[PDB]
Amino acid sequence: PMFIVNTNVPRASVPDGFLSELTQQLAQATGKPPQYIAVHVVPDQLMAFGGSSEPCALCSLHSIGKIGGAQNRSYSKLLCGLLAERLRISPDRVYINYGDMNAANVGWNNSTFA
Amino acid sequence: PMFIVNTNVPRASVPDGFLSELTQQLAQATGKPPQYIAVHVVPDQLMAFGGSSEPCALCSLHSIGKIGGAQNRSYSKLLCGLLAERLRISPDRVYINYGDMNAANVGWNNSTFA
Amino acid sequence: PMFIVNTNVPRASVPDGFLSELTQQLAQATGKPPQYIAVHVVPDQLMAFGGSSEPCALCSLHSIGKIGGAQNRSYSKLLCGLLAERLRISPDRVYINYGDMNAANVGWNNSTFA
């Protein structure tokens, strides 16, 4: 799984250990081993949500499976919870795009996961 | 809607008011309320288009619906027009990926839009 | 085609000529003319892969066609090879999301490719 957070919150506001917390929580939520979880946080971005430059986040979670209606609601409560607690972003100023990847469409280690 | 522009144009060349202009014009073009429009501009990027480092942009527009052949032509004329007028990027050095998101695959406000 | 690499490798570790090498090798691999290849390298990123912050990359390749099981394996060997040789990133710390775009869903030059 690959989780990307783009935010206007400044770099100094991202706590030490946030990448590790995201890695652990996403391993638990997806049921995938932490060795396969990649996380990427991009602070200090020029962005707006609803026309406002108040704190916001634009995110994606790509996974080979483990994507669906109920799972995505659970992921959204988890990840909005983390962004609210750790980055002080309101959940109604977060979008998360969920992408269910075919294994043949993910490259890794000189080949694909197919 | 979520609109992301990555460009090699420098930050100082992005005019004041640009995220607001994008927000307003995307609300009009997509028919979505402005409160649901998210915009993100990333200047100063290391990129090339056709092997050239002249000004260019790589963009995405994701929306729950309002994506299709005719709509996307209209969005492209709008957004290339804005990038030409405001960032001085030639329209033939812009790519925009349009993505039609299922409501169940967009997280927001601790849940999804399903 | 549009190729994006996000990496924690520092900007000074990206060798001169790398965007041109990516452009040339993706033209050859996809069979598309280099005038249509766009490339984007984002160094100095805050990321982790499998819980650690040794060099890693999170990438995407979007193309109108030329995406499939065998092609994607070939692209992965080529691109993991380039990232290992030029950025010293281990191939098992690279993810590449391959996206097959419909022509009507790619904006360019005030219209779409439809």
From Swiss-Prot, chains A, B, C:
SUPFAM superfamilies: Tautomerase/MIF (SSF55331). Coiled coil: none annotated. GO terms for cellular component: cell surface; cytoplasm; cytosol; extracellular exosome; extracellular region; extracellular space; ficolin-1-rich granule lumen; nucleoplasm. GO terms for biological process: carboxylic acid metabolic process; cell surface receptor signaling pathway; cellular senescence; DNA damage response, signal transduction by p53 class mediator; inflammatory response; innate immune response; negative regulation of apoptotic process; negative regulation of cell migration. It comes from the Eukaryota. One of its GO terms (molecular function) is identical protein binding. The keyword Phosphoprotein does not apply. It catalyses: 3-phenylpyruvate = enol-phenylpyruvate; L-dopachrome = 5,6-dihydroxyindole-2-carboxylate. This is Macrophage migration inhibitory factor. It comes from Homo sapiens (Human).
